[PDB]
Design an enzyme around this catalytic site. Sequence first.
Site, PDB file in Angstrom:
ATOM      1  CB  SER A 131      -8.782   1.070   2.915  1.00  0.00           C
ATOM      2  OG  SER A 131      -7.417   0.786   3.209  1.00  0.00           O
ATOM      3  N   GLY A 139     -10.302  -6.841   8.388  1.00  0.00           N
ATOM      4  CA  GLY A 139      -9.653  -7.352   9.580  1.00  0.00           C
ATOM      5  C   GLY A 139      -9.011  -6.246  10.389  1.00  0.00           C
ATOM      6  CB  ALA A 140      -5.457  -5.156  10.671  1.00  0.00           C
ATOM      7  N   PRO A 167       3.989   8.682 -17.602  1.00  0.00           N
ATOM      8  CG  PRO A 167       2.390   9.355 -19.161  1.00  0.00           C
ATOM      9  CD  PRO A 167       3.247   9.881 -18.036  1.00  0.00           C
ATOM     10  CE  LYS A 171      -1.657   0.767  -2.391  1.00  0.00           C
ATOM     11  NZ  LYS A 171      -1.056  -0.582  -2.185  1.00  0.00           N
ATOM     12  N   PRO A 180      -9.146  -4.198   0.090  1.00  0.00           N
ATOM     13  CG  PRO A 180      -7.500  -2.541   0.006  1.00  0.00           C
ATOM     14  CD  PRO A 180      -8.671  -3.100  -0.770  1.00  0.00           C
TER      15      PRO A 180
HETATM   16  O1  LIG Z   1      -6.541   1.286  -0.069  1.00  0.00           O
HETATM   17  C1  LIG Z   1      -5.708   0.387   0.108  1.00  0.00           C
HETATM   18  C2  LIG Z   1      -4.993  -0.181  -0.957  1.00  0.00           C
HETATM   19  C3  LIG Z   1      -4.100  -1.176  -0.656  1.00  0.00           C
HETATM   20  O2  LIG Z   1      -3.416  -1.776  -1.623  1.00  0.00           O
HETATM   21  N1  LIG Z   1      -3.879  -1.617   0.641  1.00  0.00           N
HETATM   22  C4  LIG Z   1      -2.909  -2.712   0.849  1.00  0.00           C
HETATM   23  O3  LIG Z   1      -3.647  -3.845   1.267  1.00  0.00           O
HETATM   24  C5  LIG Z   1      -2.965  -4.516   2.347  1.00  0.00           C
HETATM   25  C6  LIG Z   1      -3.826  -4.476   3.576  1.00  0.00           C
HETATM   26  O4  LIG Z   1      -3.251  -5.288   4.584  1.00  0.00           O
HETATM   27  P1  LIG Z   1      -3.889  -5.403   6.033  1.00  0.00           P
HETATM   28  O5  LIG Z   1      -4.997  -6.530   6.005  1.00  0.00           O
HETATM   29  O6  LIG Z   1      -2.639  -5.828   6.912  1.00  0.00           O
HETATM   30  O7  LIG Z   1      -4.499  -4.122   6.473  1.00  0.00           O
HETATM   31  C7  LIG Z   1      -1.605  -3.842   2.491  1.00  0.00           C
HETATM   32  O8  LIG Z   1      -0.655  -4.506   1.660  1.00  0.00           O
HETATM   33  C8  LIG Z   1      -1.860  -2.445   1.946  1.00  0.00           C
HETATM   34  O9  LIG Z   1      -0.697  -1.815   1.435  1.00  0.00           O
HETATM   35  C9  LIG Z   1      -4.606  -1.063   1.636  1.00  0.00           C
HETATM   36  O10 LIG Z   1      -4.507  -1.408   2.804  1.00  0.00           O
HETATM   37  N2  LIG Z   1      -5.495  -0.083   1.362  1.00  0.00           N
END
Ligand SMILES: O=c1cc(O)n([C@@H]2O[C@H](COP(=O)(O)O)[C@@H](O)[C@H]2O)c(=O)[nH]1
Lengths: 218, 220
Positions: free
Chosen positions: B121, B177-178, B71, B66, B174
């Site tokens: 997210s 699930g969780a 720059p 991230k 991302p």
């Molecule tokens: O908006 C975003 C961007 C991400 O990189 N992530 C990354 O994606 C992964 C999500 O993992 P999880 O399925 O355990 O929620 C984590 O490594 C988190 O840092 C996220 O959850 N939301």
Amino acid sequence: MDVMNRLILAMDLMNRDDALRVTGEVREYIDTVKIGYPLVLSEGMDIIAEFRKRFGCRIIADFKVADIPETNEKICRATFKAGADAIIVHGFPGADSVRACLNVAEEMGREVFLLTEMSHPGAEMFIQGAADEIARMGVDLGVKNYVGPSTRPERLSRLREIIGQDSFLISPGVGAAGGDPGETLRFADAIIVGRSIYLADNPAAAAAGIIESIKDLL
Amino acid sequence: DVMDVMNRLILAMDLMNRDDALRVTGEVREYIDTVKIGYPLVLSEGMDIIAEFRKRFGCRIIADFKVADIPETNEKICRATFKAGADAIIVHGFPGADSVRACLNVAEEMGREVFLLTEMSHPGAEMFIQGAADEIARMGVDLGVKNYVGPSTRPERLSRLREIIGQDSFLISPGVGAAGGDPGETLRFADAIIVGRSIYLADNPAAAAAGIIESIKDLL
Ligand SMILES: O=c1cc(O)n([C@@H]2O[C@H](COP(=O)(O)O)[C@@H](O)[C@H]2O)c(=O)[nH]1
Ligand SMILES: O=c1cc(O)n([C@@H]2O[C@H](COP(=O)(O)O)[C@@H](O)[C@H]2O)c(=O)[nH]1
């Protein structure tokens, strides 16, 4: 936080030999070093303990933490396990992400620095318009340590206004990026200086020169 | 021409010790060929963890760092990350166009790829990022970014980001699930889903990955 000479070295050299040598050359002038990903990703997190062993300096981990709360917690835990005294966290990702960092810092006896407005030209696109609100969010969350831009003293002054005189404020963009040491210290408690020192032919003289220029502010 | 992600499923390997991280990744190796490694693992085990993953598994490595600096610092971070063997790196767009361009320039020079993170997210993303996200995405398109990250937790936002970047861009997502995102719904818009905790905290990570894949079998 009490920073010697109101000067924090941004150690962004990427090899251990040079980073240790240059820091050693300027050790008489500083007691606080900002270590970021350029050095850490090149040489490993063990470099933090090495700096403490060699210099006894405080270490601010400039990791621009900018993930979701769950990941932020893990990053802060790993960073503080490595011996960092403090960590720099972005405010742009919102309050929950900052709170995750504040929690771990409290748990381990460390500090969070909230980055509100950045110093480079691109900061004007999205960050600047959110920066005052990010700073108010910091106040609401009980954040006491902040980072703001030397390159825009009117913005740095506004940040100081928002957070009050009791909060601690450090400021990068000094030297190479055009910020002036003395003007910046009107508002910031301490200046962050990287290239002007670590790329100088004579880093010790560069550090000494900066300090001479702010002698009446110390 | 985009990376070929097996089963449209990317493992977010956010365990923080080498032994567990290696065990779990090994357990799901038959289902994936693409692993996202972030700072929880890298700051715990070193950049050499990328080397160990390449040695042990036939997996592409996306460094989820991230990147969100000026720059000059962004350039250094990307160089160190690619030097260590990452195939791609994830970069924030909110610090603006120069910061993103710095990463793109290094990736081009070094033969690797940048993913641009647009909207995030988690709940806090609504405060500042969401309002900037459409413009961040448009900026990415203008800069020539081909790979993007956007949120499974907000289908309406993920759909809009897909529109902005176009059908040819590569999009990973991302929050599956969780955090509540649904695999199938997310793959309406994303090329691949990122899944961490639902797999790596499961008593049987292989079964968890297989179950996710079974649920999206008609989308493969
Ligand atoms: O908006 C975003 C961007 C991400 O990189 N992530 C990354 O994606 C992964 C999500 O993992 P999880 O399925 O355990 O929620 C984590 O490594 C988190 O840092 C996220 O959850 N939301
Ligand atoms: O807005 C910001 C925030 C920073 O942390 N920094 C950091 O402060 C340091 C400035 O170094 P320099 O004096 O070489 O410009 C770098 O490590 C950079 O990543 C910055 O320049 N601007």
